[PDB]
Structure formats: structure tokens, C-alpha cells
Design a protein around this nucleic acid. Structure first.
Lengths: 234, 128
RNA sequence: UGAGCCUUGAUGUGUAGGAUAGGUGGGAGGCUUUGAAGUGUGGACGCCAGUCUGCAUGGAGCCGACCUUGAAAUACCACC
């Protein structure tokens, strides 16, 4: 559902409501509100019926989607304990902790996963920082980290996403490109809906999915009906 | 928004003007700043500054009552006073001197002791 | 006349900086009605140099990442 601000305005004469479409018309519309000259990466926004505010009671995990996401497969790893070179060789572009924090925040921002080991997470968020808290960074608190960095990067290069939420009903995850057909889009959504159900916390609802939307990079969002076996709009 | 200032940048009223009413009493001195309609905004005393009857009745105790009363109204954004005084006590100019020296601007000083046409029989101290 | 949950407008706490790193997660220079950029200036925010915001304004144009405040970043999306 589109938002207007001073900072990108090209979307206003390309979308015109905060409205929900079936997915077979939402992706048709998302191709108009695309604002970049290059074909953009597309995200879902997955809103949830979860009532957790404690990190351990929120959703946490990762998964691999059947189809691509337009993401680069440049992959970054925070580490000072785990196998750095085995991670780099598994297809990570960047490894470090003092100046990886700068490397991830330059060039192209299209990471599939920015990983930490729990060996490094101290200096990722708590006493030290490496991006500031934002989704792009591995979460200082929840399980989004492993000391098996060399596995985590090899999963990431498969087009794996990362999911968690904290005080608000948001998992954002990349799901396709804006050129997509609605079945490819629905099929990555159905892959992720399995993966939030398999990594579901006790404090989430029966009606686990509140709303789902689809959103392009420079461009706006619009909303979709789909959540399959968990939609509130059914 | 940044993180907030170390000492305030702002103040919630700015009515500019008021009257310091002093009751320089025979045993004490009481100072109260009031808005121009006479609704009192804050006050302080001689006696509350650690003094009994025997010391609270002095122009030095009164001098301090004026400073605590100047502080009492700081938030109402008054700075301009005129002054009214009553009672036999000596809290009548040392008070004003320390009132003006606590960041206010005095412009007039006027008496408001009520005087009779003979009146009623007076109170007695030392059986006088 | 008191309070909350939420949606939204305004607003963003980890401090400072020229200034405005709430979280979570993604991501990067873009037009056909409009303009941000940036200058000027009212508003807001605040640190006194600026940004956030609207208008004059550019409208084949433009803000990142370099640089910098800092333990750490900063086009710009979506969600709560």
C-alpha cells in the first residue's frame, strides 16, 4: 500500500490507492509503480498475528525459496571465532567485523543474508555495532546467527531469505523481481509460509498471517489477498 | 528531533508582569508574587528559612524570603514587578533589594497598610 | 474530563555531528507530473552552521555508500 514522501515522488502518477488486489493484478500493478530504470528486486511484506514483544517469543529463522529474487548473492559474514575462509569460498564477497561494517554499507546493497557468528554478535549490536540496528544486519538477539558460517553462506547463495520480528508485526523478505508472473510470486510466498510455520513460536496465533503485500525497490507497495492456509482476508 | 538540552530552552507561560506583595509582620516576613488580578502564583517566607519568631522578624530573614519568592514564580514568565508592602515589620526594603537582585525588574514601591479613622481597640504585645 | 489499543499526520533515544542511526526486514540514483537535489525562506525539529517539511525553484533534474558523527550509517522502499 503506497506511501507519499518528499524523498521519492515518481510513484504518485504510477499508483493511486492504499488498496488490496488479488495477486494476479497486484503484480500487474507493481510493474507500473516500478520507479527504477533497471528491473527492481521485489519483496513481500508479511504481517502476522503474533503478540510477542520478547525476542525469544517472536518468529526467528531462515529458508530457501524455489525461485530467484533478483538479489546479487554477494553475501557478508561477521566473524571473529568461525571459519572465515570457508565462508568466503562458499560464495561470500566480504568477511570481517571492524571494517565489514563499512564494506556492507557501500556499492550494491542487495545481500541475500548478512550473517554473524554468535562469536562476533557482541560487536555486531551490543557493545560494538556494524550497521546500527536495521533489517540489513544480523539480529543481535534472535537466532539468525550460526558458528557454521561456511554452511550459512552456501544456503544464502541458494536465494535464501532471513525472517524475524521484534515489537511489530513485520517480516520483510525478498520474493522475486517486478517482472514476475503471479504464480512464480505465489510459489515463493507459499515456500516462505511453510518456513514461518516450521519456525513458529508458541506466542503466535492460529490466524498466523494478518496481511501480505508486495513492494518494489525505488517504487511503492501494493497489497495482495494471498496467505493461502492462513489468510485473515479470506 | 535530537536528544534534549541540558538546561531548558523554553518556559510554559510568559505573562511578563505581576505584583510582589509583602506582609512584613511583627514576628516574620512573608513574600508572595501574584498576577495583576491578585491570584497568587507562588510564595516563600522568612520563618521557613530555618528561623523562629526571634530571627524571622529581621530584614536579613526577609531579604531571603524575597529570593525564595523570586524563585517561586520563575515558570510563570514574570520579570516585571511593582511592589506593595504592609505590616509593622522591617521586611520592607532589604527584601526589595534582594528581590530586584534575583533577576526581576522593579518599577514602583507603594504602601498598602490600612490606616483607620480611629477604628477598634488595638492588639497588645508586652502589655502595651 | 482520565486512560489504552490501533490506523494515520507530525515525530524518532545510543550521544554527537553540518544534521533527525525507533524497531524489523529489503534495497538504491529516479521523470510526464513533478521535485526532491540545492539555494532562499516560513514552519517544524534543534546544536548556532543543517535536516526534516512546504513554497519560490530545477523539472533531460537529484540527496548513498566516498566523506562524516559514532561502537557502528545516512538514495529509497514496506510494515508496526
Amino acid at each position: 500500500m503506497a506511501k507519499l514522501t518528499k524523498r521519492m515522488r515518481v510513484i504518485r502518477e504510477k499508483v493511486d490507492a492504499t488498496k488490496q488486489y488479488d495477486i494476479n493484478e497486484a503484480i500487474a500493478l507493481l510493474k507500473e509503480l516500478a520507479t527504477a530504470k533497471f528491473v527492481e528486486s521485489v519483496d513481500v511484506a508479511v504481517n502476522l498475528g503474533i503478540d510477542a514483544r520478547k525476542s525469544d517469543q517472536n518468529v526467528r529463522g531462515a529458508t530457501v525459496l524455489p525461485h530467484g529474487t533478483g538479489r546479487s548473492v554477494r553475501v557478508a559474514v561477521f566473524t571473529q571465532g568461525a571459519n572465515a575462509e570457508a565462508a568466503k569460498a562458499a560464495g561470500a564477497e566480504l568477511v570481517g567485523m571492524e571494517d565489514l561494517a563499512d564494506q556492507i554499507k557501500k556499492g550494491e546493497m542487495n545481500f541475500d543474508v548478512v550473517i554473524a557468528s554468535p562469536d562476533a554478535m557482541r560487536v555486531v549490536g551490543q557493545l560494538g555495532q556494524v550497521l546500527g540496528p536495521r533489517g540489513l544486519m544480523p539480529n543481535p538477539k534472535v537466532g539468525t546467527v550460526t558458528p557454521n558460517v561456511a554452511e550459512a553462506v552456501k544456503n544464502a547463495k541458494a536465494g535464501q531469505v532471513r525472517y524475524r520480528n521484534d515489537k511489530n508485526g513485520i517480516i520483510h523478505t525478498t520474493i522475486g523481481k517486478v517482472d514476475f508472473d503471479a504464480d512464480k510470486l505465489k510459489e515463493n510466498l507459499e515456500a516462505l509460509l511453510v518456513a514461518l510455520k516450521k519456525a513458529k513460536p508458541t506466542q503466535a496465533k492460529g490466524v498466523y498471517i494478518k496481511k501480505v503485500s508486495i513492494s518494489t525497490t525505488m517504487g511503492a507497495g501494493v497489497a495482495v489477498d494471498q496467505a493461502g492456509l492462513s489468510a485473515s482476508v479470506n | 528531533a535530537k536528544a534534549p538540552i541540558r538546561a531548558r530552552k523554553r518556559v510554559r507561560k510568559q505573562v511578563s508582569d505581576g505584583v510582589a506583595h509583602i506582609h512584613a509582620s511583627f514576628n516574620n516576613t512573608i513574600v508572595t508574587i501574584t498576577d495583576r488580578q491578585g491570584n497568587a502564583l507562588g510564595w516563600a517566607t522568612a520563618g521557613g528559612s530555618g528561623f523562629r519568631g526571634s530571627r524571622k522578624s529581621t530584614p536579613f530573614a526577609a531579604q531571603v524570603a524575597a529570593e525564595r519568592c523570586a524563585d517561586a514564580v520563575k515558570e510563570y514568565g514574570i520579570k516585571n514587578l511593582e511592589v506593595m508592602v504592609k505590616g509593622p515589620g522591617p521586611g520592607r526594603e532589604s527584601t526589595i533589594r534582594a528581590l530586584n537582585a534575583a533577576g526581576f525588574r522593579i518599577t514602583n514601591i507603594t504602601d498598602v497598610t490600612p490606616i483607620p479613622h480611629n477604628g477598634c481597640r488595638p492588639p497588645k504585645k508586652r502589655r502595651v
